[PDB]
C-alpha cells in the first residue's frame, strides 16, 4: 500500500533515511523508539487494534468494566453516545 501514497514523487528523492535516523541521536535529546522503521517508506509494519476488543472480552465485557466504575451513578442510560473531554475550560485557561 506504500505504492498508493498521496505523495510519492517527493518521497522518491528521500534517500539515506536509515543512516540519518541512526545519527539523529546526536541532534535530539528525545530518543526515538521507532528509529528503525519509517512509516512513509516501510509502511504500517504492525496493527494492534484487535487487542482492544480482546482485552474487553478478557475483562468480562463492557457491562462488567463499567460496573466497576461510577458509570451507573451518572444517570447515563447506555454507554453508547458518550465521550470524554481531555481538559476542562479551567485547565486550558490556566496553562500559560
Amino acid at each position: 500500500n506504500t505504492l498508493f501514497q498521496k505523495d510519492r514523487s517527493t518521497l522518491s528523492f528521500d534517500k539515506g533515511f536509515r543512516a540519518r535516523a541512526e545519527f539523529k541521536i546526536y541532534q535530539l535529546m528525545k530518543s526515538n523508539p521507532f528509529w528503525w522503521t519509517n512509516p512513509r517508506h516501510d509502511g504500517k509494519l504492525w496493527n494492534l487494534n484487535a487487542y482492544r476488543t480482546d482485552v474487553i472480552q478478557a475483562l468480562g465485557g463492557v457491562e462488567t468494566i463499567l460496573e466497576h466504575t461510577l458509570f451507573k451513578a451518572t444517570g447515563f442510560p447506555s454507554w453508547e453516545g458518550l465521550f470524554w473531554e481531555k481538559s476542562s475550560g479551567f485547565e486550558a485557561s490556566m496553562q500559560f
Binding site: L3, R8, S9, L11, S12
Partner: peptide, 25 residues
C-alpha cells in the same frame, strides 16, 4: 503529469528493488 509520473515510477521501481533485493540477481 508526465514528470510526476516519471518520478512516481522511479519511486515504485525503488520500492520494487528494495523488495526484490537478494533473490533474483
Amino acid at each position: 503529469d508526465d514528470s510526476e509520473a516519471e518520478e512516481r515510477a522511479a519511486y515504485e521501481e525503488a520500492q520494487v528493488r528494495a523488495a526484490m533485493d537478494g533473490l533474483r540477481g
